[PDB]
């Protein structure tokens, strides 16, 4: 199954995401975090295939998280940014830092699941 981790400081949203993704037969939520530091700690412990990553969060933001994942971890989930902040420089930074996809809030759950499955099933070297 696709193992998903969720990082966002909106607790209600995390619960909705967890409920929906848990209802998909091919997916499982293996961890959630409410800020960037907790997200990094969660990634030390869990090895998701997919990370849903909010940007605006306390302690450490999702772009700092993205940069740390690429530089500091052996195992790397494919990351889907899921944020309200789709500012021109931020989108560009996200792709430079290794994000696999970037979805704006507000979003539809079905579209999100569609992207999860495409990103998991993705590279250029055969
Ligand atoms: Ca936020």
Swiss-Prot record:
Segments forming a coiled coil: none
Functional summary from the UniProt entry: May play the central regulatory role in sporulation. It may be an element of the effector pathway responsible for the activation of sporulation genes in response to nutritional stress. Spo0A may act in concert with Spo0H (a sigma factor) to control the expression of some genes that are critical to the sporulation process. Repressor of abrB, activator of the spoIIa operon. Binds the DNA sequence 5'-TGNCGAA-3' (0A box).
UniProt protein name: Stage 0 sporulation protein A
Subcellular location: Cytoplasm
UniProt: Ca(2+) binding residues: 8-9, 54
Residue numbers bearing the 4-aspartylphosphate modification: 54
Ranges for domain Response regulatory: 3-120
Processing and modification events after translation: Phosphorylated by KinA and KinB.
